[PDB]
Amino acid sequence: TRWTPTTEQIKILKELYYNNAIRSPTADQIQKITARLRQFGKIEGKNVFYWFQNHKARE
Amino acid sequence: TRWTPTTEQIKILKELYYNNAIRSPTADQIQKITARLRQFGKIEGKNVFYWFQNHKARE
DNA sequence: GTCGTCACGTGATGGG
DNA sequence: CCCATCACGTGACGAC
């Protein structure tokens, strides 16, 4: 079904977005970010892709 | 506004519900559970009450 | 002590 | 790229 981020994963994403101004990550970045997040859960590239797109759209 | 459980809190609640068969916890238990969960976030007894009420109903 | 309902956040898409 | 929805889980109530 649908992806649900660990809070730990959210900490990583939030750190990239706010502390590092990563808002529209490139393909290379999505794959590296995905590797990082997989330590804490199942996760695909598209999960990380949609997350930045949605969080950007909403901030 | 509304409470958002951290993953580690969700680990604790499911662990009490399924592994300890606590499904309509008593008041003393609600207070004890809240104390434990507060280690991981802001939390009030009424959150834990609603959580069991909601999880029991929808299971 | 149960049920129905709301309120809201958010993952997931599609269209242009 | 950005927009607008959709899908849906779920914290909160109210009522009884």
Numbering used by the authors:
A (entry chain B), B (entry chain A): 37 to 95
Show sentences the authors wrote.
The HD transcription factor WUS plays key roles for plant development with at least four distinct and essential subfunctions: Firstly, regulation of stem cell identity in the shoot apical meristem (SAM), where it is required for non cell-autonomous induction and maintenance of stem cell fate via stimulation of cytokinin and suppression of auxin signaling. Consistent with a broad functional portfolio, WUS has been shown to bind to a diverse set of DNA motifs in the regulatory regions of downstream genes involved in SAM development and signaling processes. Here, we have combined molecular, biochemical, and structural approaches to address how the WUS-HD recognizes specific DNA target sites. We find that the DNA-binding preferences of WUS-HD depend on appropriately arranged sequence motifs in a direct tandem repeat and that homodimerization is one of the key determinants to achieve high sequence specificity.
